[PDB]
Amino acid sequence: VPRVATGAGIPTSRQTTVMVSKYSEKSPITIPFEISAACLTHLKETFE
């Protein structure tokens, strides 16, 4: 802390220790995605 005090009778506020823990915040996203079984059939049945 930037410390300063002074004066003749002006009260001197003592030194200050500041520790702040500041958290993070999660936001898990998701897009859905579609592949049909008719799409996967042609790789995996091997027609003529």
């Binding site: 004066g7 009778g9 002006i10 009260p11």
Partner: protein, 48 residues
């Protein structure tokens, strides 16, 4: 403040340590000074 004219302005500065306390809702007078504020023309020109 019937001092001589250059002591009147030094009465207006050195001895106008008469402020309004801050934390109170109704205006209360200051407790321990900490500054010579620029007064109103009271104690200098005596006009509202």
């Amino acid at each position: 403040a019937n001092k001589t004219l250059f002591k009147t302005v030094e009465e207006y500065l050195n001895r106008s340590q008469d402020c309004i306390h801050g934390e109170t809702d109704l205006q209360y007078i200051c407790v321990e000074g900490t500054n010579s504020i620029v007064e109103k023309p009271c104690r200098f020109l005596q006009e509202a």
